Symmetry: D2
Amino acid sequence: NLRGVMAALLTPFDQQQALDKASLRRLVQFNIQQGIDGLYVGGSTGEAFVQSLSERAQVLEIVAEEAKGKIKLIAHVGCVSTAESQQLAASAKRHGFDAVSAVTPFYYPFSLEEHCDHYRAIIDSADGLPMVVYNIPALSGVKLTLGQIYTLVTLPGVGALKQTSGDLYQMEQIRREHPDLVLYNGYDEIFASGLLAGADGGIGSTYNIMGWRYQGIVKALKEGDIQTAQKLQTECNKVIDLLIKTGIFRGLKTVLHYMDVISVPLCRKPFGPVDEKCLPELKALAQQLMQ
Amino acid sequence: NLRGVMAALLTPFDQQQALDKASLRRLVQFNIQQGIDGLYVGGSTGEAFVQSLSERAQVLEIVAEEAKGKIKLIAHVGCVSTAESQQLAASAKRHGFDAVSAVTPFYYPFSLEEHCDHYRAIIDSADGLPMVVYNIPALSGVKLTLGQIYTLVTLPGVGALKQTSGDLYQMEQIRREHPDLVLYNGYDEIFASGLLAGADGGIGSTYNIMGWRYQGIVKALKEGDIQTAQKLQTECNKVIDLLIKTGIFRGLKTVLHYMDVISVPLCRKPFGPVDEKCLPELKALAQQLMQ
Amino acid sequence: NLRGVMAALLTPFDQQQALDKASLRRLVQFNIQQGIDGLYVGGSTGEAFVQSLSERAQVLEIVAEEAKGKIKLIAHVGCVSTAESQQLAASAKRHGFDAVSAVTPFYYPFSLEEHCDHYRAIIDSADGLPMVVYNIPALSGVKLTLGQIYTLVTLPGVGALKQTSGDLYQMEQIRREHPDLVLYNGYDEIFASGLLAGADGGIGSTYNIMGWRYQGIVKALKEGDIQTAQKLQTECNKVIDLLIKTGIFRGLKTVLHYMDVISVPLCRKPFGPVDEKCLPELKALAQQLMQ
Amino acid sequence: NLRGVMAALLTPFDQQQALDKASLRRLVQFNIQQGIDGLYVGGSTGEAFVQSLSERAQVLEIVAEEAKGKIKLIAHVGCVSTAESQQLAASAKRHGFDAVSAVTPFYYPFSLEEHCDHYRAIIDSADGLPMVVYNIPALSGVKLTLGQIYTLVTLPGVGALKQTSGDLYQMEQIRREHPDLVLYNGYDEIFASGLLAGADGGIGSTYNIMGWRYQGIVKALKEGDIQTAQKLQTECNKVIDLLIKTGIFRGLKTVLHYMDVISVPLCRKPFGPVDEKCLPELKALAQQLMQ
């Protein structure tokens, strides 16, 4: 019941880089208005790693207030620290999120056994809430093999995997070995191909400004209209090429600003500002997006 | 007219590791009776880098005597040396192949300008036959960017790209920037996902024993039957799982010996023999496929 | 004056994983009793990335109260977030630390410019105090090019570079490029060869249990006696080989325990515990080191 | 008897890319005049992978004719194919070389056992001449582990290891495990540090134009004069810095040409010509090298 298209919610900030509560609620409502199935909060896209636990706990709360009931809620609780991750997991259940999620602890090299204990400890604190293992090798440096995945996803309490890997052979191998596992496609650039390989849903950053397109891809593939699926994916990637140039997060925010959703499209340092030269294209994208 | 499903032809050897002509002719006929759109010969799968220019040219001649007119024929003439590649290319033209192809020169690092000159020289010796740029990072050690690809595929005489990369984001980008370029999916394990992202056909080594499934996945994606495309793809991946454990070339060769096509299923040294413990699975697969 | 051998300080924890104030002070003096030139505190070796800013700030204070004036004190203030790093920077100034240091912000990919602003900001909040750039690709995932390193170390306020890279050609290039820059050799296993390549110092985690050996390596070379510099390095590596098998940090805290310095050789989660099998070997080590 | 400083011999070609016999002999005599301990012929630097077996056997003969008895002679017989490697190993014995060498087979992935049989077979055909295992991860794509190094180095008939790796931790680990093994440092840019780490001597391409500097580094270390040892290494790295910018083989050949040792400074295709803008620095360097 938690399989589907979930947006990786961004964390709006004000001019002083503090949480822009008013913009956060507006973005959540906006995401809901696009027909998204749920919000994955406190993830990489939410700039959680340059946030304190308190701030992250705060976001979970506001979003739960604005969304609990409307759509599905998944809280990314991950931290390098197990203890910290347990701490946020508790807040997750306490605020009624439908699921908990944690990125493989990074920076320091951890054995497969240590990763399992990390997830066990967190699952424990999630007190019931199912765990969504988060695999994103490009940002974490943890390149999980098929076997390590097997070990992690078969952990009592795990109900899903956020596969942010462009290896679609592994994507189908994972589906084939775990026919009952919820598979989220992490890379928006390959959504259509991800679903075809074995993913039954997705979680992406760009869902925030065009989630209906990804939903459209699910419909077309479901309906057998491969042509339109490619048509939509092509259009998504034209947007993604741009966002990668301008900076994805700041690019997304900037677009939401012109859409009247975000007040100040700033990210937290070390993230820098959007190149002035890019605002015409972003505003334009925002323009057409309001379709 | 190069668009389609081409089998990366294996090179049968006898007990003394010399070319097994009869098995070669047998293998070519087997592929044709299988409904393949053509053959890509002298490539990685053909163990070309473990053959002499003389041996590789002899293969081109035999295959031409057996398949010219029947199916499309692409000759992989690529060597590290430009001069050797040219020699093979003139031999390709002389024997009536439909096109030539060449892996990006490896071992020694070369600049983009040097790869272009390498392809220009070969294209020149190809005297008319279109060129198939062959990108296979995993083996060559040459990781091309979207930009370099652009430059290589826009070279006069270049008519297609054999993409043996699992980066399906890049695959669609290549399709978007080059709408008319023939794009071959290189990794069999992701054929379906490849086609959907922009590939208009493919070249693979497992097409030798089950190319009909790939043609099958093509028809399915054409008739909008995603259901059948997936079913066929996962079946193929179950095979690839096995071949990857036994050794792809040797494995495929053993299955062929069992299908009564190849007299001796050996690969050339340093490639070792198939592990005894694997023969049951390969026998069963042969049996399974024969029906 | 930041030149010399500096031990990368570990932060001892009790059974509940809380900071072991007693053992911390005890460890500091032990390092001094060894004749160390200074301490690099709050870094990777300090399990800093599994601590809160509050805990990191506290450790800074403790250590200072114990060593300010006795030896050189460098404070690793690195955090992904710039604002958090700035906060820890002021605390460094506040407790009279000699220098500040910060790992290249990781996980999220940042541009050279972003990394620059990041360091400037921290240099600013350091209210003076020279900045020690910390380059450790294997943990941060940031592979700095000689050019990028050039941009970072010529930044106003930077007085040193902690090179935890095994590339000794780059090391000598850095030295040749910046004759006035302090170069700390990062990997203990190549200390000798590191100083020979151009490093005039070094910061290591194993210094905590045998800093005198590294001090002896420095002397042996300064005196033109390679023969003993090697013997020492070989010895150090015999140790490091072991520590690698057991888990560098946990292994070190264990040896320190067998040396009555640290109460409980525990690292925080997800860091697991030492292997019961590797205990005796670690005991013998602690035994030999005491001489 | 294989300990020492061996130059990795270049292969001079004429304007039509054919072997230049007169120039090959001069380069041999030239290296001998430099007081080089021996020559490593038919290696990467010799452009062997763009030559035919016939051509590589011809280079072997001529060099033997010019140097057998004068200095040590090692014949790089490596090819991907085990059979071709044996054929060349036979020429080696046939022509009086003191040893054979083979790069780890590349392009196709081979098992450790497969690599072991490759060497056994080479060694068998080497008919008595010892084997020098050649490890160069960067070009081959084969990053052997300390363990695989042990298995290969302990093979019967293996008398040395050409270590073209910048990992000086592994270098010392190899010296430690195999004290009676000849260890050739492979990267000229770290010659001083490699030796200190444990290297017995070295093999390099820049030895062709400045072997004496490397011989200097050796004597400097043997005499406990680390000061001049670095000076020499710094000078070599300034040259290497340039050679890398212009193209190492083509650069060395151009300098040699300006020293009147070789007629045409050409490398074979796909290697391109030296950029005109670089000739000034190359002529200047050749001037001082001649002094």
